[PDB]
């Protein structure tokens, strides 16, 4: 599986602050967590709500040492045209993170989210830790938007267990909730408490 | 990819009501939505919290015409032993849904959740509709527990767009929130309504 | 070669009069000549000048029983967004012919104009006769715009020799110019005249 | 595709000034632009009009640092026989550029213009820059003559954008017309200037 | 065949004294004989009688410089749960030897005891000498328990012929019985009696 | 694996009552249990003690509806020459069961007991039930003789659990000892002899 | 080998009487012997002497129920241009037999006369009987012209042995010379003389 | 094709002066032209007339720095038996050149004259120049004898154009007839013996 | 092995009574035993002595329902020339049996006696019964001639056991000698009389 | 073919003087001629007569620098049991040469005498010279015993021509008989004396 292993590296053109840049995924290793989400096409319907939802809460991810990266098979010129469209008109407005262009579809293919039939990507999202290892996947069919909240929760759980490597996070864990020690003897400390 | 296609069928033994039964995944086609979640091993730590979290809210899924199915590579005798252990002792107590045994590991293989190094499954969860099609995938590494709330949300979004085939669900959609029509002309109806 | 043989058939989504339609190339067989031109990407620079140039002279092609079809690897949503952009802003405005979407890149691949490196098509143009046979190719690198005039000339020559199957068109032939009979004995009638 | 890449090199005999010479395509790299055009056969009909049309305007290409090269599958003895036939008799008369013999058909094969059924080349024309890279392709079926004017236009556009690497040539561009900068911000300078 | 050759080596997790340890089979080479037995699954019926049967007599095997190793496809968490159950409740109680986990099933596969249809091992038992060579195999279908007595007999025969490499053991040989020299001329001393 | 599946069928010549006969293994299906044991070579040392040991107790197996079959890679002419040798001279004397000749070695090969290096069989023994399914394997290296007593115990346990299909035999079970009637709880929808075997 | 077997059939365009025709080699089966000769290229030097040499003596071959076919890799347009040139200007003038175009080079390839390096045929000549069988091959390198006399001699020998199938032709046989019967006992009549 | 390229080399036993010798074809390179002719079998009918015809005119070839070599699939013992047979009896008598034995048939095979159906060679003749390059081929079916006169003509034409490397021989050329000095117009940059050959 | 199986069939031209015939090996099945011997080459040295030895004793084989067949890779014309050569001159003289020509060497190849290095056959001899099955092979290197006496003995033993299918022939068996019954209990008749 | 080439080497256990030895065929190279004969099985019927026939005349072969080697697929224990059986009882009695055991059947396989159907060897016999090259093979089907006399004759002829490398042995050659020189002109000495 992809989860539990190093992410497939890529180097691609992207749009950031309405300028054309390059983004190399491995360049974030050692530096930040990465939330990499794919969406099907520019100028669609669920996709702008996801993209701007993540843009509006980007400060929360930046303060948690996490970068957000959006990817679709569109070119950087579609990306740029869409950034310059008003949100009220179905556009994106200005974005707080890079919009990555996968024109060759190799990135979507390497993450297993490419629908070969249609040449577009599913709504797949991947949380990558500072060592470059994929720790989480959410993959939705095209009609169902994802959740910034659940992405935030999963990310906080990952950072929590990586700072306290002797803990694991129970179902529904939030910051402030009790964790547990994955040990037949010490986990009882949790199981008695409830 | 798995999402967007018919689920790989299986027929496997399971523990239900402390009895041994058989479960065939395709038997739910035409009848119920399926939430199929894998966990690594019996007598572990995050896994019991996931299993009982879903069991305690099983009635809510039952009201939504959805069955929950837990799967791991352990045998049905380990499953039965774990159900008969108290929750206070790290056990499951009584379960409201079948615990399926993937003893040959073929089910985990077909859903791409098997860590071949270790012979156990990742924390993969799959939502399957009444036609047997996978519509949602959640896959966590072994240490991070999942969320029954987000599973409930995604399942409800799927049911909404399947009853209203002209709608799609925006980011963060919950029941009661506005959806939109995936049409460049009718989408403006949703878009020109956000201050 | 592609030229001299039946065009590779396709069925694809397209934008026409700002609506989503389907276009099947073989459906024009027996009905009209087809001028099929590929361009690299939506929201570029030479491409809008080519697309609108052909749009403005579309009546000349319609009166000659010829349809124009543009193709790129962009989706119909980019196509539609670009049609709804003003020409003064680098957009296309309203188009007189369909804009075809090759999201899977199979069409560009089958016509041999796909740059595999970049996932976009070269500036290839193909004139297809009423039997579906490719009779002409113009393929330019990305920086050089094509010519509506030379396309018109080549098309008029093709229709001329197909109406008078005993004639062929010399270099630079225009309507009104003398043709010749490709026959060792009758071609002399041309060669003496000049 | 051929366009956008280095041309397939060849070394072949040719007729020039009614003498037998050798021509190596890569020998023009670093020195001149190359217009390489194929024609099907000697002693035919459209082909002599193309060949002499280019010969009569050869001086214009020579002024543009460009050589013209004609190629067909005929031998150099047929080529020489055709040059020595009067134009009034369907011949070539004197030619200003080499006529290359593709007797083994390997050159036509490498440029994708060989009709394998018939063993002759289509009316393919290729523009090659000083680095040896194909920048333009014209391929006609056997009955439709080509245009020296459009070849001149495309060659001049190529030379313009290669001397001005920040420019691109719009549709129908001729020398003296405005070009544009392929940049979403600087392109508006061209676009907001057309009534 | 497996018997007569070096055992397929493995490194696996196991439960011993209610702790998780590692066991590498080649680590016993030069040190002890190994009695390596597979059983199908934890929390079953015949298997606990075999496992505890070997545990109760482990001192007899240890005095013979022999270690016992139990293996099944269950994880160490099932193994530990089963050890921490009393024998009266269907458990194993405390064991005198390691319970090995073959969670990937590769060990059962390499010893040819994996029923691929069912993903569990047959009741296969292997006697391995100090050089790491398989000398004996007992493989039962799931319903028939094995016998610690016959394992002890076979191990004693193997140890006898390895300490007296010029002897071989006749049918039913027990310590104290006559052996014979596998030689046409010297066997006659045995058959004449 | 071989155990748990139908035995590989064979048809071979054999020595019985000092005459050359044919034996087809599938012919015992429906009729008798089979104790099929291999030994490496004729005129050896452990092998005659095993062979005569089984012949001397053959009546006990006959009363249990069981036939014994010995197999080796020697020909029937070796088998007959060895049967006609006195036991005091290392021979077999007359035997109560057939001695099967595996000259082409395909039989040893199909049962996985052929040492390819040496062209002889290990001391493999196989207990086969009335449906032809191998239920037990004992495979010894060449120097260690087998036990007729343990073969009898395993055979008796197999016959017990097949006659009482709800029972299983614990470790070390002998006739007269308690068996086990396990009670895996299957639902009645599933209920219509697998799980009590583990 | 080609000699002794049916010729590779072909259908090709040719020039005859300054007109474009088609020639299919199997169309001559049952009707005429075929003298099929290849030459390298049109507008050369040895080749016209061979082509016109055969043309000037075509009546001698036609009286023997034999057609001559010339083949080169040039097109019919080169062929026609060369025919319409006078012999005094290096041309062929009018020809008594078809000039075949092997523009795809497949015919030369199938008769093994194609020099692949140069894309032209050697000076190969083949005599084909009324059943379509190759009976004789003459293959020269480019600088040595062939001989119409030896072609006539070989054709006359082949026709002789096919009309008298019990005879064979000795070395240098011409019409009027003694033949022999290929038989150990009847050959003696020949060798005794 | 064979013609225009170096001959396939061979080394074979042969009969010469009623003794067994060896012949290696590459040994003539730099030294003599070679007329290498195959015939199907010894003790036949067209073949002796060809063989004796070449032997009787061998001096004419010797004076032209040319060796003749006959080859067939028969052994040297057949060749010697046939040489020792009188010509009036269908034999060869003594020969002026070696008779080469192709018992393994590799020689006939390398020259493409082996009828695989029958294991014998067609009446193939090959003229090889001093550099070892085949310049001419005549291949007759088994019933048609070849012509020593035409071999002489072709050989003389080859020697002429190789001694006068600017000339070529028209159709039917004989010594004394006009040759041709063609004048293909190559540029002096290209000018430093191909094109006048066509 | 060849011995014990049907001989590889062939059809080949041969010389018999100084005439050309065809010989098909399977045509002797049911009719005669066959002694098929190969020799290396015509006009050699050991081979003529073998061939004439078999011809001189051919009547003894004919009375035993046996044909002799000699085979070498030479043609029928070499064979005929050699038959018409006097024995004092190294020839064969008149032959009582056919001389078969294996020009394509397929026969020598199928009986495994062809020296591929040299294209000739070894001194292999095969005794074939009326059913077409090879019962004996003798294969000598080129310098060691074979023995007609031993061929007659082997043939006579084969005919004996095929006439008395319950008997087998001990070492050195000749007509008049004791046979034995290949049975443990019946062979005692032969064994007990050993002196 | 095997005849004319180095024999396939082997190393095998054998019985000699009622002891177990090892025998390596290449160890006889340079030292002795080898008569290597296969027989089908121990305790059979033709085979003991062959084995004892060779043992009884072994001294004649020993004086000719020749060893005898018998081979069958039986084990050395069958071999020893058979040697220790009386000849009147179908046994061998004491043997003058080694009995080799081919239990894995590789030796019979490499000499082409193994009947794969039955796993036993044919009655194949091979004469091997001091250089290790097979010069003669006799292969009989199971019922026809071989001849020690013909083996001695073939061996004596081989030794004769290897001692006189300019001679070859005609058909039926025995010591004292005329040889011949395999040369067209020298063979006339033999041929001209034919009566």
Our CA-based measurement puts residue A160 at a distance from the nearest CA of chain B, in whole angstroms, of: 10
Does any CB of chain F come closer than 8 Å to the CB of residue B27? Answer: no
* Residue J84: exposure state from Cβ atoms within 10 A (0-12, 13-18, ≥19): middle
Helix (H) or strand (E) holding I66, with range, is: strand I66-72
φ/ψ of residue G103, rounded to 5:
-65, -35
Contacts of E63 (CB under 8 A, 6+ apart): none
- Residue E55 three-state SS: helix
Our CA-based measurement puts residue B29 at a distance from the nearest CA of chain E, in whole angstroms, of: 26
Give the span between the Cα atoms of D37 and B62, in whole angstroms: 75
Task: Please name the residue of chain D whose CA is at the shortest distance from the CA of residue C45.
Answer: D182
Supply the DSSP symbol for J92: -
- Report the Cα C100 to chain-centroid distance in Å: 12
Q: Does F190 contact B77 at a Cβ distance shorter than 8 Å?
A: no
Give H190's contacts in chain D (Cβ within 8 Å).
19-22
Domains and CATH numbers, chain J: 1-195 (3.40.30.10)
Supply the DSSP symbol for B112: T
Give I107's contacts in chain H (Cβ within 8 Å).
none
CA angle in degrees (0–180, nearest 5) for I71-I74-I78 = 110
Among H41, H116, H117, select the one facing I77 at the smallest CB separation. Answer: H41
- Side-chain half-sphere of J114: how many Cα atoms within 13 Å? 17
Contacts of I151 (CB under 8 A, 6+ apart): I35, I125, I127, I138
Task: Please name the residue of chain D whose CA is at the shortest distance from the CA of residue C186.
Answer: D45
**Helix B76-83 to helix E76-83 angle, to the nearest 10 degrees?**
50
Give the span between the Cα atoms of E117 and B104, in whole angstroms: 7
Our CA-based measurement puts residue G179 at a distance from the nearest CA of chain D, in whole angstroms, of: 47
Give the span between the Cα atoms of D66 and D136, in whole angstroms: 14
Q: Does F185 contact B21 at a Cβ distance shorter than 8 Å?
A: no
**Helix C76-83 to helix A76-83 angle, to the nearest 10 degrees?**
50
Contacts of E91 (CB under 8 A, 6+ apart): E48, E82, E83, E84, E85
Give A118's contacts in chain C (Cβ within 8 Å).
103-104
Residue D112: CB atoms within 10 A of its CB come to 18
CA angle in degrees (0–180, nearest 5) for E7-E10-E12 = 145
DSSP codes joined into one string, chain A: --TTSBPPP-EEEEEETTEEEEEEGGGGTTT-EEEEEE-S-TT-SHHHHHHHHHHHTHHHHHHTTEEEEEEESS-HHHHHHHHTS-GGGT---S-SS-EEE-TT-HHHHHTT-EETTTTEE-EEEEEE-TTSBEEEEEEE-TTB---HHHHHHHHHHHHHHHHSTT-BB-TT--TTS--B--STTTTHHHHHT-
CB proximity under 8 Å: E 75-114 to F: 112-114
Task: Please name the residue of chain D whose CA is at the shortest distance from the CA of residue C122.
Answer: D3
Structure determined via: X-ray
Q: How many CB pairs under 8 A join D and G?
A: 60
Does any CB of chain I come closer than 8 Å to the CB of residue H119? Answer: yes
Give the span between the Cα atoms of A119 and C108, in whole angstroms: 13
Give E142's contacts in chain F (Cβ within 8 Å).
197-198
φ/ψ of residue H180, rounded to 5:
-135, 135
* Residue J193: exposure state from Cβ atoms within 10 A (0-12, 13-18, ≥19): exposed
Give the span between the Cα atoms of E191 and D39, in whole angstroms: 102
Length, in residues, of chain E: 193
Convert B136-173 to b/e letters by CB count within 10 Å (16 or more is b).
Answer: bbbbbbbbbbbbbbbbbbbbbbbbbbeeeeebbbbbbb
**Helix D148-163 to helix C148-163 angle, to the nearest 10 degrees?**
160
Substitution target in D113, D128, D138, D140 with the highest count of C β-carbons within 10 Å is D140
Give the span between the Cα atoms of F185 and F191, in whole angstroms: 9
Contacts of H78 (CB under 8 A, 6+ apart): H42, H43, H101, I41, I42, I43, I74, I78, I81
Using only the alpha carbons of chain A, give its radius of gyration.
Answer: 18
Our CA-based measurement puts residue D79 at a distance from the nearest CA of chain G, in whole angstroms, of: 10
Contacts of A107 (CB under 8 A, 6+ apart): A8, A10, A12, A71, A100
Q: Any long-range contacts for G87-91 (C-beta under 8 Å, 24+ apart)?
A: G87/G48, G87/G52, G90/G43, G90/G48, G91/G48
Give the span between the Cα atoms of I41 and I45, in whole angstroms: 9
Q: What is the resolution of this structure in A?
A: 2.6
CA angle in degrees (0–180, nearest 5) for I101-I103-I105 = 105
Give the span between the Cα atoms of C34 and C122, in whole angstroms: 19
Q: Taking a C-beta distance cutoff of 8 angstroms, is the pair C98, C69 a contact?
A: yes
Give the span between the Cα atoms of J108 and J117, in whole angstroms: 13
Cα-Cα-Cα-Cα torsion C168, C171, C172, C174, nearest 10 degrees, comes to -10
Closest CA to J109 of J6, J3, J10, J5: J10
Closest CA to A44 of B4, C77, C41: C77
Substitution target in D121, D170, D195 with the highest count of C β-carbons within 10 Å is D170
Closest CA to A72 of A33, A34, A98: A98
Using only the alpha carbons of chain G, give its radius of gyration.
Answer: 18
Give the span between the Cα atoms of H170 and H180, in whole angstroms: 7
Our CA-based measurement puts residue F161 at a distance from the nearest CA of chain E, in whole angstroms, of: 7
For chains F and H, tell me whether 3 or more CB atom pairs sit within 8 A of each other: no
Q: Taking a C-beta distance cutoff of 8 angstroms, is the pair D19, H187 a contact?
A: yes
* Residue I182: exposure state from Cβ atoms within 10 A (0-12, 13-18, ≥19): middle
Q: What would the 3-class secondary structure string for chain C be?
A: CCCCCECCCCEEEEEECCEEEEEEHHHHCCCCEEEEEECCCCCCCHHHHHHHHHHHCHHHHHHCCEEEEEEECCCHHHHHHHHCCCHHHCCCCCCCCCEEECCCCHHHHHCCCEECCCCEECEEEEEECCCCEEEEEEEECCCECCCHHHHHHHHHHHHHHHHCCCCEECCCCCCCCCCECCCCCCCHHHHHCC
Using only the alpha carbons of chain J, give its radius of gyration.
Answer: 18
């Amino acid at each position: 599986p992809l989860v539990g292993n190093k992410a497939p590296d890529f180097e691609a053109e992207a749009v950031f602050d309405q300028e054309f840049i390059k983004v190399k995924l491995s360049d974030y290793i050692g530096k930040k967590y990465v939330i990499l989400f794919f969406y099907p096409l520019d100028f669609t319907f669920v996709s702008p709500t996801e993209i701007t939802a993540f843009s509006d809460r980007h400060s929360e991810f930046e303060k948690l040492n996490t970068e957000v990266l959006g990817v679709s098979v569109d070119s950087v010129f579609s990306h740029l045209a869409w950034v310059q469209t008003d949100r009220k008109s179905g556009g994106l407005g200005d974005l707080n993170y890079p919009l990555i262009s996968d024109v060759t579809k190799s990135i979507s293919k390497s993450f297993g989210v490419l629908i070969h039939d249609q040449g577009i990507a599913l709504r797949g999202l991947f949380i990558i830790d500072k060592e470059g290892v994929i720790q989480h996947s959410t993959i939705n069919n095209l009609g169902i938007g994802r959740s910034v909240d659940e992405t935030m929760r999963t990310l906080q759980a990952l950072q929590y267990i990586q700072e306290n490597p002797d803990e694991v996070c129970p179902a529904g864990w939030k910051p402030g909730e009790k964790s547990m020690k994955p040990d037949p003897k010490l986990s009882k400390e949790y199981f008695s408490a409830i």
